[PDB]
């Protein structure tokens, strides 16, 4: 399923995640936008032999026991297939693991590089949110 | 750039009383700014962040107001240590830029 | 104790280069944006740039991106920024501090002064 911004934005909204952890919607649409390009089905493989799921690119090496990675902590406590649904609450209350351990948005590789040091705002205008 | 004004550059006060320094930025940095406190020989205190959060150790009569382009720092309570300079910081959006600083002096 | 600490004083002779280096301790290094700020009486502070050490990606103000270059060693945990040929201006102290994960700085080093 492929998200429409704002139909993003206002169901990380109504999730509580503007300003969760001090990050306002901006950061959240952002990130989703350059990690999976607004995709709940999006999936990546890196060097480690573990992949990204979805919407918010969670890894399976420490986040969630995809299966296929032998180091896994799976500290959101999920199958990684979980966080591929059409629906992002269990990403969201994942990647609401995620920014909560000291690390912050930074553990998301796309927001660093793409996000942090622009106006995030720029993301959620025209919505109503 | 994001250019901030701060405002007065110097502020003299009595201990118990209470200033308020301003900071303007050059567009609405959406409540993205920070505050810090520099007292000579002593590494730079950030104060508060993001328009009114505190950073942790910090005594609660610093406070911080604003939202687009206009943001205070209250002070109450001078305490005779708190006279220091104090500078703003645009975190919105690179580059990182900060105000011109307001020199706090204690009264006499 | 997060804790960045800098090198001494500097007495550089017009145009001949100068590294700084800040030695981080108290956490996990990789982990954090470092920055270099600079300021000189009357001016206020201005920033440099900033690097993530997991990856050496940098960020450079448009101003100083010809000037100077930011660099870590990740098992030393030292941050460093080098000025290729200073001029007269380049004195001054120079700031490392550690990004809070906002873009506020909530630890700094105690500062480096670069006398050219």
């Given amino acids: 399923k492929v998200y429409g911004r704002c139909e993003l934005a206002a169901a990380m909204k109504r999730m509580g995640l503007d300003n969760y952890r001090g990050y306002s919607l901006g950061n959240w649409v952002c990130a989703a936008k350059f990690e999976s390009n607004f995709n709940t089905g999006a999936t990546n493989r890196n060097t480690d032999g573990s992949t990204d799921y979805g919407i918010l690119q969670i890894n399976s090496r420490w986040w969630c026991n995809d ?22 609450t269990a990403s969201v209350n994942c990647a609401k693991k995620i920014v909560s351990d000291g ?8 927001w660093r590089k793409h996000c942090k040091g622009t106006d995030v705002n720029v993301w959620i205008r025209g919505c109503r949110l | 750039d994001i250019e901030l004004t701060q405002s007065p550059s110097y502020l003299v006060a009595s201990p118990g009383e209470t200033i308020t320094i301003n900071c303007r930025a050059s567009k609405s940095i959406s409540k993205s700014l920070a505050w810090y406190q520099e007292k000579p020989g ?40 708190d006279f220091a300079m104090y500078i703003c910081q645009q975190h919105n959006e690179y580059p990182w830029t900060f105000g011109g600083g307001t020199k706090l002096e204690i009264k006499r | 104790q997060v804790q960045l600490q800098q090198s001494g ?24 944006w470092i920055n270099w700020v600079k300021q000189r009486p009357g001016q206020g502070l201005e920033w440099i740039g900033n690097i993530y050490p997991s990856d050496s990606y940098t960020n450079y103000n448009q101003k100083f991106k010809d000037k100077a270059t930011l660099t870590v060693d990740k098992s ?41």
């Fill in chain 1, 67 to 88: 299966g296929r990675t032998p180091g896994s902590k799976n500290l959101c406590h999920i199958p990684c297939s979980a966080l591929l649904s059409s629906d992002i």
């Fill in chain 1, 103 to 110: 690390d912050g948005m930074n553990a998301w590789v796309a």
């Fill in chain 2, 42 to 81: 002593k590494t730079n205190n950030l104060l508060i962040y993001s328009g009114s959060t505190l950073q942790s150790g910090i005594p609660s009569r610093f406070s911080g107001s604003g939202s687009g382009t206009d943001f205070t720092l209250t002070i109450s309570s001078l305490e005779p240590e």
């Fill in chain 3, 9 to 32: 004083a500097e007495l550089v002779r017009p145009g001949a280069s100068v590294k700084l280096s800040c030695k981080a301790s108290g956490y996990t290094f990789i982990s954090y």
């Fill in chain 3, 76 to 116: 030393s945990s030292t941050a460093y920024m080098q000025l290729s040929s200073p001029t007269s201006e380049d004195s001054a102290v120079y700031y490392c501090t550690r990004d809070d994960n906002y873009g506020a700085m909530d630890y700094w080093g105690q500062g480096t002064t670069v006398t050219v």
